[PDB]
């Protein structure tokens, strides 16, 4: 009565802002600020690179990065808004590199999520009432899903500012429509009113300056003009000033985007090219085109001609069929195995389900649909323009959401704004507003029975929404300790350390094309791995990854393009060296994820089709109720009532691929790759080591089959560490007739690093009666884990030739403990190879 007269809507904003601070900063605090500040995902690590580079060469930034996609290099589509914002934030707090810079960037997306309450309040306040604005502003602070997960501390990505400026633009533009409509007697400007479409242009500007494809807001606003004009017989609006605030907003935004509009030679919808500058400038001309159509319609241009007001929309149909008729004058789901994209409202096997809409919006999706449905009839009767315009944006965000998972954060504002409408209606007609009015002020004619149901409805819309966002915000989602400790080791113990650190910060020229291998200013080498870790390898290890999260460096096998997919899915070392030498690689970094759950994506990428990748996997382990381990090649050999381990055991083709020869065999059977680093075991098997020793078989095999079954009782599969043991156990049984490298069945490190080595080419004559020469050496890793390297060569012309990769005096922590035990028939020797012959590929003679 003394404070809650104006500050009622502002206190709940502070309340909503404080719940946003708890979910985005306080919940994931102990997961982001751990061994190091853990920037989540893969994108915020590249922004860490660009911002660290922009601070280096401030006040100007790069637009081509030859430090990634090592042979050629990749262009940067990451917007200059967040790059500069994180750069100005990094220099004010005196944090220019390392964990200091990342600690500042962790707050960028969290702050953006908290500030997102303002444009949500602003947008729905100008189309609806201030009550619903309070609800929507409260609802956007707890809406879970991809909108939440990418507003979390330690996730400095452009997605939060993407929906921020997108909603800020619609609000400021519609605000510019309200402060302008009816005002046309030169009061339309007055050096004050101009600032409402101007600030709308700065929102659209900053929207495109943060996301390349942000120009898509222009057809959305142009759609408002389209439907406002063609529906002159059904909807009322000030089509004159609506066109002015449009041509002013588009021209201002194009004026803000023009500085950054020449950073990509040739048109592109994602990279910062002059194409987006034409859309914003063109939309202004179409907006001014709508203005003169309305100015002509004012004089009865379509009545003095014999047309009729029923026929004015056809003038727009014509003009909006010419400019779009003269503009051109002047499906493979295999390549999309990523988690960000996949058909929403559809199962990964292909089945309509709303579990996606629940997990990303809580109850706000179903309260939003009821809000969109009422807003449709509320517009169908009131015929209000901004309610129809908001519906157009609601349909637009639903179309984008209907096809692609990634755009779940664009629909959070749709659901929150429209759930607020649905909540503002049931609060008005169930006397909850009268209760809040009278329990504090003067009593009204109400019913406490209706008010009770009014709070019961609010709980059904708030509790499931918060209980999801509360649990979904208790983790970061970045690289684990096994990956960070493995990558920081590479930055220190691999050659050209200071040369990479210097070129990591240099400003690079903008080439006209990246078809050509880049001219590097020093002796460079490449580090190949799966493209998920390209931004990690570059931003942490400070090396050059061939495959990066930019969907580049993958290659394929159906076209023989050198890349990560053609390398790791190679079936022999000869084809492996081909892609290796073509890309000038030096180190490979395979982890336990590439070996198991991520190999299916690599097999599909190299094959460029799913059924072609079916040949890499086989059957399943079943356990009959009689308690027997079994392998059924098909699904009809499975005994009845037998529990199935939900893990796809690979076929015989996988066991002789590059990724298998690396991580599964610990580098054995290879001639040009020696292991130089192995991270600690996966976290689930590190806790299992306190009671079970990992060196003996049938003991680690016992505890591995127990974890698989006791987890297969539910619909989940064994852990990644357990997935390795089953792959090793099935190797000793299905690859038993071969056993090229008889491997101990035992868990290995989570991340391993190898080095491409010429190899000590050891040759000589043999006793002419044996046809093979075998070499063996017990090798010890940095985790004290022991394994046996093996290699067998044929005898040709009575001679032999082995290429031993490992060395005995290497500076790397992984080196053998026993000399090379060579053998041919019955003669054996004890030879030790040192690094001088290994790196240089020296020729060695030794008869047997």
């Amino acid at each position: 009565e003394s404070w809650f007269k104006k500050y009622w809507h502002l206190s709940v904003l502070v309340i909503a802002a404080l719940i946003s601070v708890k979910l985005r900063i306080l919940n994931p605090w102990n997961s982001v600020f751990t061994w190091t500040v853990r920037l989540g995902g893969n994108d915020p690590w590249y922004y860490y690179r660009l911002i660290e580079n922009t601070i280096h060469n401030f006040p100007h930034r790069i637009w081509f990065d030859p430090f990634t996609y090592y042979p050629y290099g990749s262009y940067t589509h990451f917007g200059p808004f967040l790059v500069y914002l994180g750069s100005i934030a990094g220099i004010i707090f005196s944090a220019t590199s390392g964990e200091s810079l990342r600690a500042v960037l962790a707050f960028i997306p969290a702050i953006g999520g908290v500030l997102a309450i303002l444009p949500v309040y602003l947008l729905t306040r100008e189309v609806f009432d201030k009550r619903a604005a309070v609800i929507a502003a409260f609802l956007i602070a707890i809406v879970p899903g991809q909108f939440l997960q990418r507003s979390i501390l330690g996730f400095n990505d452009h997605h939060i500012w993407e929906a921020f400026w997108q909603v800020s633009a619609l609000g400021t533009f519609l605000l510019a429509y309200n402060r302008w409509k009816g005002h046309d007697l030169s009061h339309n400007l007055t050096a004050r009113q101009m600032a409402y479409p101007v600030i709308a242009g700065i929102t659209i500007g900053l929207y495109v300056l943060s996301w390349g494809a942000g120009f898509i807001i222009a057809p959305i606003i142009l759609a408002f003009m389209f439907f406002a004009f063609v529906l002159a017989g059904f909807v009322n609006a000030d089509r004159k000033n609506l066109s002015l605030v449009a041509v002013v907003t588009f021209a201002v935004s194009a004026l803000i985007y023009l500085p950054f509009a020449f950073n990509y030679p040739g048109f592109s919808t994602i990279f910062y090219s002059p194409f987006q500058l034409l859309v914003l400038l063109g939309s202004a001309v179409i907006a001014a085109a709508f203005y003169q159509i309305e100015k002509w319609n004012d004089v009865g241009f379509f009545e003095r001609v014999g047309l009729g007001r029923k026929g004015m929309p056809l003038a727009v149909i014509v003009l909006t069929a010419l400019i779009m008729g003269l503009f051109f004058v002047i499906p493979k789901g295999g390549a999309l195995t990523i988690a960000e994209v996949y058909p929403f409202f559809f199962t990964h096997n292909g089945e309509f389900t709303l579990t996606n809409a629940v997990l990303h919006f809580g109850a706000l999706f179903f309260f939003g649909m009821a809000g969109i449905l009422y807003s449709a009839y509320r517009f169908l009767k009131r015929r209000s323009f901004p309610e129809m315009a908001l519906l157009i944006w609601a349909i637009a965000m639903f179309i984008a959401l209907w096809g692609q998972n990634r755009f779940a954060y664009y629909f959070a504002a749709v659901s929150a704004v429209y759930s607020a409408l649905a909540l503002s209606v049931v609060f008005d007609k169930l006397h909850l507003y009268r209760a809040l009015e009278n329990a504090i002020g003067a009593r009204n004619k109400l019913s406490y029975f209706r008010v009770a149901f009014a709070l019961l409805i609010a709980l059904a819309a708030i509790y499931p929404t918060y209980i999801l966002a509360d649990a979904q915000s208790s983790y970061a989602g970045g690289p684990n300790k096994q990956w960070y400790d493995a990558l920081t080791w590479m930055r220190e113990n691999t050659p050209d350390g200071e040369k990479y650190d210097e070129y990591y910060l240099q400003l690079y020229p903008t080439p006209q094309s990246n078809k050509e291998p880049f001219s590097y200013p020093f002796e460079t080498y490449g580090v190949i791995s799966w493209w998920d870790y390209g931004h990690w390898i570059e931003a942490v290890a400070h090396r050059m990854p061939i495959a990066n999260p930019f969907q580049a460096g993958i290659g394929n096998k159906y076209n023989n393009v050198p890349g990560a997919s053609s390398f790791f899915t190679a079936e022999n070392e000869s084809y492996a060296e081909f892609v290796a030498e073509k890309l000038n690689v030096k180190y490979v970094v395979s982890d336990i994820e590439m070996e198991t759950c991520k190999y299916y994506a690599m097999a599909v990428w190299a094959e460029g089709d799913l059924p072609l990748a079916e040949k890499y996997y086989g059957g399943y382990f079943y356990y009959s109720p009689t308690g027997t381990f079994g392998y059924a090649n098909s699904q009809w050999d499975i005994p009845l009532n037998s529990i199935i381990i939900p893990l796809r055991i690979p076929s015989e083709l996988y066991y002789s691929t590059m990724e298998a020869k690396l991580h599964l065999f610990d580098g054995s059977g290879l001639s040009h790759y020696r292991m130089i680093y192995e991270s600690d075991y996966p976290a689930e098997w590190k806790s299992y080591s306190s009671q079970v020793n990992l060196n003996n078989e049938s003991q680690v095999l016992q505890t591995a089959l127990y974890e698989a079954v006791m987890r297969a009782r539910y619909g989940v599969s064994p852990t990644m560490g357990t997935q390795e043991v089953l792959y090793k156990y099935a190797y000793t049984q299905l690859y038993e007739k071969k056993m090229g490298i008889p491997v101990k069945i035992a868990p290995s490190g989570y991340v391993k690093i190898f080095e491409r080595v010429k190899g000590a080419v050891v040759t000589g004559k043999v006793s002419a009666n044996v046809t093979e020469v075998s070499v063996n050496a017990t090798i010890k890793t940095n985790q004290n884990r022991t394994f046996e390297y093996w290699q067998t060569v044929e005898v040709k012309n009575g001679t032999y030739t082995v290429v031993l990769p490992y060395s005995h005096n290497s500076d790397y922590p992984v080196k053998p403990i026993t000399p090379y035990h060579i053998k041919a028939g019955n003669v054996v020797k004890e030879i030790t190879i040192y690094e001088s012959q290994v790196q240089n590929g020296e020729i060695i003679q030794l008869d047997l």
Binding site: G41, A339, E340
Partner: peptide, 7 residues
């Protein structure tokens, strides 16, 4: 759900 291949 973060540009990582399906885990």
């Amino acid at each position: 759900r973060y540009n990582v291949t399906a885990c």
